[PDB]
């Protein structure tokens, strides 16, 4: 997910909540001036057309077993991919 | 606390005068901007104890008995002189070599009057917990107010001494209300692991449990050592975590996990200098050296002189020749031995493997997979490559293993197609195998075959097959005897 | 009803059995004899005591007894026993 | 300084699987095998303390709503 | 605090004014316990008692109340004893140890709760030292409070006062004073009172100085306060558990277990005394059966494997060892599954193992993970003898193990990332069991172990036996089942039995690890080549006993056990070196062993010849499988038959 602009319902207008590291707190309340202490908070909610969504894809790498030595394990490591 | 300045100015001194240290850390920052030159070293100087004695006894008391007062400005001091050094273009660590002990102990012997001090335990490694990073230094960016913004997160291993935990997480928007952008790659992290040791099977008392303790190793340490190691650990003592004392009701009596830091971890059980190599050129010229060479390496065992001129002819091995775009001939040359029992082919390779300079040694069954990857959801021959595998009890071995065999030796390459990671991967390994005659003592007399009992093509592929008889003589015997005797004396 | 007993006395005769058994059949098949096989003796002697109703343990039971478990033991061997069976006589 | 009455066979004579609701907080007699059981775990009972309140009761069993000195415990099980 | 004050005063003046005539008893028990550096005192509760009645009417009252004011009351005597002024001195411990009333395990239940308890029970097993805390130091998380909390004995929580809050207090490690804990966790003694239940047991934390004071299996009387702690496994349902102050192991105890390489002068005494006996080897070969009887070449053998015996660690790396091995195998009566449980009490540190390793320990070397060396009958067992049965019966994994063990003496483990080589001293004694019985013997004398005799090759000494009653035997064992009633006249005489029964076999023991670690022995020439004619006969003779293809052995590992059966018994004589008829005794010792070495039709079955031919020159969809097709409906072939005749023409080349 990235940007997920959730939708208003009285006054509309948008706000743009940024995807920062794993995940995020969704929020409620009222941001838009106009829904908000008159009257009272309007409601509004995540729209997912409007939302920018980037493919996600996980996969770990063990090693190549010939680059461990005499002794240990072969040890994985994780690799986020995204868009193309 | 102008008395841990005083630590620092009187550390200060015991350093240049003696000088025999100052000349390491030069090593150190000379080597490095060498390899800024070039087209790795852990930055950290051993302190041999014995030099401590000498200057002040105070103070060499103190390392042993407080350990968490002492290090730390000592560190700071040498910090303070490896920036004094030249030039510009780290904490670093302490060492403590020793001049043990006291102090001395095994893990078994140990807790609490030998807790908060310094401590060398020796023990086996079991089992290495994994390496994982550790944060350290947070560093950030501010825009477009600029500047470069940090935070220093302290953990429970953090210098030595306990301080006011930082953790957890990032600052951002440090007042004022300005972003900050986490900044990786200037921001420091310093590698952890920690790893378990158990007293020395051996000196074991009674079948009484065998006790183990915990060993943190900080920074360059890591990934120093291999579960099942005969190690010598150094450390200071320490224990960490509340006994349950710090939340209210925890009721339990169990209490006070400890654990080491640190510190040096000197396995125990190449550098050939200005003379050694001299010795060699010097003894190259001699004509006979070879059959001195071939005796050298049997001690214990009679006779058997071209079979030990074979090993030697294994631990050399024909250079490697890759052809101009084409496959590559075989280089190294592979060894089987066969006769009746007490021949010492079981003892002759152990031999083989101390001086060997590698490899892994695989006895029977054995496997699995040998030398494969295994591709291990979700070898050795791989692991011994540039090496002497060894093999006993080589005719035990299951057929479907020696069909894999074939690839290995001559081939010289091992093929993954398992699921999967489909790779081909190169062991190059030398190889020699130990394996009984069929069936009884019959070898001697036996056909030239029938008498292997592992046809066919394997035979070949083994460069040399050495046949020795156990049959007896009562002249042979009594040379047997005598040699026998001195060798128990 | 019935707990049938054994009277210390005479029964001593009973270990001389034993040991004329065991010995002279070491020689030929294996084990099987132990003393757990000599206390079956004892044991199946008072069943028999109990199918007399007798409140104690007499010679006629032990014969009874000693050629059951004797015969047992015989005839579980292999066909070497027949050798067996020659010393079997004083034991009929 | 406490005897509590052990009050022999009480017919009811309800067996197990036969109890309802009715049965609350009235004695009825029940019958059957026993698994295995819990080990003798010292119960609370009374308390008592120097001080330093006073002894407070409990509990059959609640405990709601720790000090101890010399308190007397009953084994529980 | 003045009533603790008048308290203290009490049991000073009961230190200092203490007088059993007229030394003072305690106040030299604390002299001679600070100069040693034991920081400890055991008073003994009769001359408490007798002291003032007073101060154990209220010490058997509120213990844990009043016992911290008893030490601290002590080590502010030993401020007045060890040093003098005008450091640092910790609290001593106080073990009390006292006779009272014994109160057995299963009579402990509440009422007597924090009221000091005498009981007695065998420790099962000693929980790992962890530590508590004793005086440390704590700074808070903001106003940066420094205090010091000393903390006492006997779950204390710390205090939260100079937001601030809830608890900012922080445990400073680097000035905390620390002590130990153990953990024995104790089941009540088999004679009583079982009945028809497994018996309980009760978990106890002993401290300070009496931690590792007792070995897991001994006997003891503990003494102790007896308190519940909570831990969380409702409602309540706390758990009891018994504090020890102080414990006592029962008679001796020390010297054995707690043998240290050391002993007393006396001994070294009786035992230079015991080396002058010219019947010495014979007398001590009637030691160690006095209840089996007879089997004597077993009944020596015993003896030469206890003493172990050469050992040598010459360069190069390769290092020979000692000593031997030992195999009882026959049908049972032989009583070898008990000699060895007899071994097992004489060797000084032995370890009876009968599997397959039991129950949850396995047999050999193994790695297991902390879940935040497993052991194995090796290990545990190193340095000495091991016991095992059932040897054919072991399985494969750890039957490697232990055939790569017993030649180097040591276990190399590659697992994971612990690559270790660890070490096996032991001597590996088994008792096999043969298959079939007697015809075995027709049989081959080897190939009994699976399909291989390379076991066989191994094991140095080799002793499948019988158990011939020399008519006074099986009357022996027959008239001891007859009676085995009143009036115990029979274990009496078995006492004076053991009494005379040559060396005590309790001093047997001190006595092996005497000679085991004082001297090691070496060979004599003559003896040397006296042995060399010895074998090169024994090579020779028996090949062309050989030449007929007689089915059966020599290999010079056993010339080599040969070797250390003679340093082994150089080792009893104690002499620092070899003699000739010292020998003499051992060539024909080791000829009784190859003695033992020696010891549907077949052809018609051994055919399957028939099938390999004209039948399958493959050899597959054949396999045991045909030849059970073949051989299942022909009113034919057993399973040993089968092999048999298989393992034969695989041998004989058809
Ligand atoms: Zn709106």
Redesign the interface.
């Known amino acids: 997910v990235e940007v997920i602009a959730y939708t208003c319902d009285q006054c509309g207008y948008e706000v743009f909540q940024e995807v920062n590291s794993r995940t995020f707190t969704p929020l409620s309340e009222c941001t838009s001036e106009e829904c908000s202490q008159n009257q009272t908070k309007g409601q509004l909610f995540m729209s997912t057309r409007a939302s920018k969504f980037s493919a996600f894809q996980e996969c770990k790498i063990q090693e190549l077993s010939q680059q461990v030595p005499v002794g240990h394990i072969p040890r994985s490591l994780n690799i986020h991919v995204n868009g193309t | 606390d102008a008395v841990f300045g005083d630590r620092v100015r009187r550390f200060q001194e015991f350093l240049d005068t003696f000088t025999s240290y100052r000349d390491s850390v030069r090593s150190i920052q000379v080597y490095n901007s060498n390899n800024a030159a070039n087209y790795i070293l852990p930055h950290r100087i051993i302190i041999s104890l014995d030099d401590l004695r000498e200057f002040d006894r105070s103070f060499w008391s103190g390392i042993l008995v407080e350990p968490a007062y002492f290090i730390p400005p000592a560190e700071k001091a040498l910090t303070d002189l490896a920036d004094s050094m030249d030039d510009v273009p780290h904490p670093w660590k302490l060492s403590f070599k020793g001049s043990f002990g006291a102090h001395a102990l095994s893990p078994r012997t140990l807790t609490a009057q030998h807790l908060n001090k310094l401590v060398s335990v020796e023990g086996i490694v079991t089992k290495t917990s994994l390496v994982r990073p550790k944060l350290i230094r947070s560093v950030h960016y501010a825009a477009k107010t600029g500047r470069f913004h940090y935070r220093d997160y302290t953990d429970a291993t953090t210098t030595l001494t306990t301080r006011i935990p930082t953790p957890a997480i990032y600052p951002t928007e440090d007042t004022e209300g300005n972003k900050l952008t986490t900044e990786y790659g200037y921001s420091t992290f310093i590698d952890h692991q920690r790893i378990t040791v158990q007293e020395m099977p051996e000196m074991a008392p009674a079948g009484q449990l065998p006790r183990s303790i915990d060993v943190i190793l900080d920074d360059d340490l890591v990934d120093k050592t291999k579960p099942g190691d005969r190690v010598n650990v150094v450390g200071v003592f320490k224990s960490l975590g509340a006994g349950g004392m710090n939340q209210s009701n925890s009721n339990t009596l169990i209490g006070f996990k400890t654990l080491i830091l640190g510190n040096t971890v000197y396995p125990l059980h190449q550098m050939l200098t200005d003379f050694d190599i001299r010795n060699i050129n010097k003894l190259s010229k001699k004509k006979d050296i070879f059959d001195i060479l071939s005796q050298s390496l049997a001690p214990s065992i009679y006779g058997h002189d071209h079979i030990k001129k074979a090993i030697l002819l294994m631990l050399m091995g024909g250079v490697e020749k890759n052809l101009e775009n084409g496959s590559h001939l075989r280089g190294d040359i592979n060894i089987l031995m066969v006769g009746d029992p007490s021949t010492a082919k079981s003892q002759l390779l152990r031999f083989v493997l101390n001086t060997a300079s590698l490899a892994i040694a695989t006895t029977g069954r054995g496997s699995s997979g040998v030398g494969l990857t295994a591709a291990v959801t979700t070898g050795a021959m791989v692991l011994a490559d540039r090496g002497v595998v060894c093999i006993d009890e080589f005719d035990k071995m299951t057929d479907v293993d020696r069909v894999a065999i074939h690839e290995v030796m001559e081939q010289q390459t091992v093929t993954i197609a398992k699921a999967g990671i489909h790779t081909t991967l190169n062991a190059r390994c030398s190889v020699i195998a130990a394996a009984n005659p069929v069936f009884g003592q019959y070898d001697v007399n036996r056909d030239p075959h029938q008498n292997i009992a592992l046809p066919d093509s394997l035979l070949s592929r083994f460069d040399l097959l050495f046949v020795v008889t156990d049959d007896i003589n009562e002249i042979r015997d009594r040379s047997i005897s005598e040699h026998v005797l001195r060798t128990h004396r | 009803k019935i707990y049938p007993k054994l009277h210390q006395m005479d029964m001593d005769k009973v270990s001389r059995v034993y040991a004329d058994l065991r010995r002279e059949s070491i020689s030929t098949g294996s084990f099987p004899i132990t003393v757990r096989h000599l206390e079956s003796i004892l044991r199946i002697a008072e069943s028999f005591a109990k199918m007399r109703l007798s409140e104690f343990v007499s010679s006629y039971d032990l014969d009874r007894a000693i050629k059951v478990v004797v015969d047992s033991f015989v005839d579980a061997q292999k066909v070497s026993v027949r050798r067996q069976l020659r010393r079997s006589f004083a034991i009929y | 300084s406490e005897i509590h009455v052990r009050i022999s066979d009480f017919p009811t004579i309800y067996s197990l699987r036969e109890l309802r609701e009715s049965n609350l907080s009235s004695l009825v007699r029940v019958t059957g095998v026993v698994t295995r059981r819990t080990?003798?775990?010292?119960?609370?009972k009374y308390v008592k303390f120097n001080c330093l309140l006073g002894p407070f009761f409990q509990d059959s069993?609640?405990?709601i709503r720790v000090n101890g000195?010399?308190t007397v415990?009953?084994?529980?099980q | 605090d003045d009533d603790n004050t008048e308290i203290i005063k009490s049991f000073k003046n009961f230190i200092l004014e203490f007088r059993l005539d007229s030394q003072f008893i305690y106040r030299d028990q604390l002299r001679n316990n600070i100069l040693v550096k034991n920081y400890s005192l055991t008073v003994n509760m009769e001359h408490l008692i007798g002291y003032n009645e007073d101060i154990y009417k209220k010490l058997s009252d509120e213990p844990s109340d009043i016992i911290p004011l008893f030490e601290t009351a002590i080590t502010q005597v030993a401020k007045r004893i060890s040093i003098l002024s005008r450091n640092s001195l910790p609290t001593f411990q106080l073990i009390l140890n006292s006779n009272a009333n014994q109160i057995p395990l299963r009579d402990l239940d509440s009422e007597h709760v924090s009221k000091i308890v005498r009981l007695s029970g065998i420790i099962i097993s000693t929980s790992v030292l962890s530590s508590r805390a004793t005086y440390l130091s704590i700074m808070c998380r903001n106003c940066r409070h420094t205090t010091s909390i000393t903390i006492n004995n006997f779950t204390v929580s710390l205090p939260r006062s100079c937001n601030c809050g809830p608890d900012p207090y922080i445990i400073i490690h680097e000035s905390s004073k620390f002590i130990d804990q153990q953990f024995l966790k104790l089941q009540e003694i088999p004679e009583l009172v079982p009945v028809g239940e497994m018996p309980r047991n009760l978990t106890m934390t002993c401290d300070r100085y009496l931690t590792n004071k007792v070995i897991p299996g001994t006997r003891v009387t503990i003494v102790g306060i007896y308190s519940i702690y909570n831990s969380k496994n409702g409602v309540a349902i706390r758990t009891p558990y018994i504090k020890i102050l102080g414990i006592q192991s029962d008679v001796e105890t020390s010297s054995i277990w707690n043998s240290v390489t050391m002993f007393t002068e006396e001994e070294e005494e009786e035992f230079l005394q015991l080396s002058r006996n010219p019947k010495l080897y014979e007398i001590l070969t009637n030691s160690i059966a006095p209840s089996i009887f007879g089997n004597e070449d077993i009944k020596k053998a015993i003896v030469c494997l206890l003493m172990g015996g050469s050992k040598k660690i010459l360069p190069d790396g390769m290092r020979l060892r000692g000593d031997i091995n030992v195999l009882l195998l026959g049908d049972p009566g032989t009583a070898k599954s008990q000699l060895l449980k007899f071994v097992e009490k004489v060797s000084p540190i032995a370890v009876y193992t009968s599997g397959k390793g039991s129950s949850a320990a396995g047999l050999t070397a193994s790695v297991q993970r902390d879940p935040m060396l497993e052991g194995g009958a090796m290990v545990l067992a190193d340095g000495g003898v091991v016991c095992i049965d059932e040897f054919d019966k072991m399985r494969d994994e750890d039957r490697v193990a232990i055939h790569e063990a017993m030649e180097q003496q040591t276990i190399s483990i590659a697992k994971a990332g612990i690559t270790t080589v660890l070490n096996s001293r032991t001597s590996v004694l088994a008792a096999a069991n043969p298959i079939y019985g007697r015809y075995d013997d027709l049989k081959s004398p080897g190939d009994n172990i699976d399909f291989q005799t390379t076991i066989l090759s191994r094991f140095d000494m080799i002793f499948i036996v019988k158990d011939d009653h020399n008519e006074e035997r099986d009357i022996s064992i027959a008239n001891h089942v007859i009676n085995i009633h009143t009036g115990n006249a029979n274990a009496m005489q078995n006492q004076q039995e053991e009494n005379g029964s040559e060396i005590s076999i309790e001093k047997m023991k001190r006595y092996i690890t005497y000679c085991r670690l004082k001297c090691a022995p070496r060979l004599s020439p003559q003896a040397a080549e006296k042995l060399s004619s010895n074998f090169v006969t024994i090579r020779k003779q028996l090949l062309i006993n050989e030449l007929e293809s007689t089915e059966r052995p020599i290999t010079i590992r056993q010339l080599e056990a040969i070797i250390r059966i003679t340093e082994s018994l150089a080792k009893l004589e104690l002499s620092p070196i070899a003699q000739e008829r010292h020998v003499d005794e051992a060539i024909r010792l080791f000829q009784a062993s190859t003695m033992d070495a020696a010891s549907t039709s077949l052809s018609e079955i051994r055919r399957f010849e028939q099938e390999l031919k004209r039948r399958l020159p493959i050899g597959w969809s054949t396999s045991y499988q045909t030849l059970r097709r073949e051989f299942v409906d022909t009113h034919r072939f057993s399973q040993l038959a089968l092999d048999k005749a298989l393992y034969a023409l695989e041998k004989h080349e058809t």
């Not at chain 4, 080990?39 to 609370?44: A, C, E, K, S």
């Not at chain 4, 415990?73 to 529980?76: D, F, G, H, L, M």
């Open positions: 080990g003798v775990f010292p119960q609370l069993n609640e405990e000195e010399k415990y009953r084994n529980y």
